[PDB]
């Protein structure tokens, strides 16, 4: 009826490193060559050039004379004792993760940190339940060394952790600084923070106020300064402090980070949390 | 031979109005007189006027002459009630009967005050919204808010602007007044109130780096708007109608909410505050939160001395020439302009000290201020005799209306429109010199209310109010917890010149130095008829207060005449266009 030469050349089944038996490739290149023999396939250039990828000359025909013979004397598919290996090997592999899904895991771990399983296992629910996001998580680090790309991976994950730890540091650093004053709204004076290379548009009293409010609502992941903006307006004290009143959550958060950073440059001598449990 | 200079000691009539002054819990109310009445909305109304003033360049003319009362009459407000606005007005010092404005005055006179407010309401809107696509190239002064827009034969008058606001209203943050509170009691805005996982973390997923940055997600409940069921901002009546649609008290809320939103979104004024908060020169006394003129705390008699001292110090500033042989002999253009005057200024003080014979210390000042100025140019760029209300450096955080603060009592204010701008011929907002001189002309009857109508006197706030701020209370209340929602810190002391005198007579009972420590000897759960509080300076602690009280009795005694004329001015000439031809006949009319 119609030839169409039905014969699978030498297809592969190994994408990027999704954590799976690195020796399976060999086990596959046995039945992958058998699926060509049983259907009668002729080894050409499309195979050899895609099996070594080199523009050779006199020693190029050897490969074509090799891949051909390997398929000719390719014994029956993996022995019955070797077949029981298939399942076992690939059962260990988490190749059941879409590249798109995987690339999200190595991202959510950023703004959520290393071991925040729940925090990340919730912002997706792709393949299956949390157990999946935990199993692959443990498997990830425990056997990460087998990386295909860690340059812009293990760094974009770690780097975000630094920022998180810095914010959580500024938070805790603020806490102790307030516990250092009976009435903070007056006696609070920064040791190192006092700047000069820039115009102090904000009142010294104001800076003190916006800090008392940062302590009031902490420094959560998202919305924070929009509350300070409200708190400022709510207070009848700055009822005529037009500049203060006119500070938008954005152009106000600016001063906030500036103060936190400057506060950081003060209480950075007691940021060594004793880890001797 | 050693000069000396201290800039902070001789500020340009701008001492730092710090908040630490009353850092001690000291709040009293032994001032309960028939004239003193609580005014909850006073604060917002003040801010509303202060905003107009500081940006009078952006607003209409008819908006920058509003009397505090014009707001009351306009929004149907009434002093007294600690809650919102009183039921009415207390007719006379003795009647105990209340009545509303439509009874007090005339209707056309009321619709007038109402129109003003709507203009103010529309002007604010356009100022933040319809005026955001600006493309200046030098200076803008054309596109404003015409008095015609308000009186337009259309419906989209307020309909359009409000439509925009209703969209941004959410993010821009609603005022406490209208915010949907959470009576739930189970949740509080400050702390968190919603866990995501009933269990956090325990079995580490990467033992190599045991950290766990995010134990579990919390969700917060921030300031949310009132339901459409009762949200004033979505009052359908307001569209076709005006601002009067909302409740009298609400009206104030909105106008305040705007005066803030505008300050944070009006591409025009927000870029303006920047131009005022980014001066290439910083105030010698640093950048404090609040600023007031020198005399408003030092006092007239104390500020004149500060200038005498200043002159005595700037005299030594030149008589310390260690090597004047370099300046005197060698004649170079650039350093000689100063040297030349260094001889005249000296041969002038000698042309007074030796040419007066203890005549009067008046000529030892009134005829020196003009020639001293060129001297200050260099050493102290600022002195306690320059017009505070005429320096872009202090303008913003500066606080007009401020009359002074008395220890263990609080601050005192007085709403008076149009501080800086044009035709400030009559405005009380000037240097201590011209000011004390201007008031002195009304005290001696040299200047009649007529002269006001002649010198754009109607461009000013005709009617007036004298308020008192309980700063001490507020200061502390805010120092602890922000449970200010519902408290009162503003108090009216008088509404007209008449009652102003009653307050000055009442002010005597406090300025008095307690000497009566004996018995009267006159022989033949809390109830107070009106007022019987006189003792104030019990201990020697309140001694500092007795003075700051008296100095206030001074300003108010001199401010009396000029204010009585402003009143009479509106009574006679009701915002009447002077003209040209008619402007003369009124002068030779001789109205007796």
Structure summarized in a few sentences:
The complex is a heterodimer of chains A (277) and B (592). Chain A is mainly α.
Could you walk me through the main structural features you see in this protein, from its secondary elements to its overall organization?
It is classed as transcription. The entry lists the keywords chromatin remodeling, nucleosome remodeling. It forms a dimeric assembly. The complex is a heterodimer of chains A (277) and B (592). Chain A has 277 residues and is mainly alpha-helical. Chain A folds into four domains: 1-92, ISWI, HAND domain (N-(1-d-carboxylethyl)-l-norvaline Dehydrogenase, domain 2, Orthogonal Bundle); 93-148, Homeodomain-like (Arc Repressor Mutant, subunit A, Orthogonal Bundle); 149-181, iswi atpase (Single alpha-helices involved in coiled-coils or other helix-helix interfaces); 182-277, Homeodomain-like (Arc Repressor Mutant, subunit A, Orthogonal Bundle), CATH 1.10.10.60. Chain A is 53% helix and 0% strand. Chain A has 13 helices and no strands. The longest helix of chain A is centred in the middle third of the chain and has 25 residues, at 154-178. With 592 residues, chain B is mostly helical. Chain B has one domain (1-592). Chain B has a five-stranded antiparallel sheet with strand order 1-9-8-7-6. In chain B, strands 2-3 form a two-stranded antiparallel sheet. Chain B has a two-stranded antiparallel sheet with strand order 4-5. In chain B, a hairpin with a 7-residue loop joins strand 2 (89-90) and strand 3. In chain B, helix 4 packs parallel to helix 8 and helix 8 packs across helix 9. The radius of gyration of chain B is 29 Å and the shape is globular. Chains A and B meet through helix 6, helix 7, helix 8, helix 10 and helix 11 of A and helix 1, helix 8, helix 9 and helix 19 of B.
